[PDB]
Amino acid sequence: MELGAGGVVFNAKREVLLLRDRMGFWVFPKGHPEPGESLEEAAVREVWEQTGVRAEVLLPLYPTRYVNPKGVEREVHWFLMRGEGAPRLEEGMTGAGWFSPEEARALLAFPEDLGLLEVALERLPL
Ligand SMILES: Nc1ncnc2c1ncn2[C@@H]1O[C@H](COP(=O)(O)OP(=O)(O)OP(=O)(O)O)[C@@H](O)[C@H]1O
Ligand SMILES: [Mg+2]
């Protein structure tokens, strides 16, 4: 199992930051923690690296698990975040943008992410 850390990021319009990976799936931004890095710090770094968005962690969410196409089981720890700015897709792109809850429900490719989206929306203050 390999750890992961990501963020469910929201802007003022309460839109969520989504990315389209190599295999064509829309997901939340996340990546591998660096040695000595906490998951929260790792999550903030991964968001900035992959989208150029500077975000603030509001509170922790919960981890999701799954086995990727390479046979590696991943445990990704998530954090609710706040951020702004036009996303800048990284050279591992194909897609990115801010989406409303309803649009995100139609893009997110996995059950774990759809579930995570709702729980995040509920804890996101007004
Ligand atoms: N919740 C999920 N359930 C099932 N499959 C998923 C889930 N999330 C992602 N995947 C699949 O696994 C892939 C992502 O795996 P993973 O996060 O390990 O790789 P990565 O982020 O592309 O690269 P890396 O982790 O090596 O830096 C997706 O491209 C997709 O095919
Ligand atoms: Mg990384």
Swiss-Prot record:
Residues the record lists as binding Mg(2+): 46, 50
Domain Nudix hydrolase, residue spans: 1-121
Enzyme class: hydrolase
Family: Belongs to the Nudix hydrolase family.
Keyword Hydrolase appears in the UniProt entry: yes
Residues engaged in binding substrate: 21-23, 30-32, 66-68, 74, 112
GO annotation terms (biological process): AMP biosynthetic process; ATP biosynthetic process
Protein's UniProt name: Diadenosine hexaphosphate hydrolase
Temperature-dependence annotation: Optimum temperature is 70 degrees Celsius. Ndx1 is stable up to 95 degrees Celsius at pH 7.5.
Known EC number: 3.6.1.61
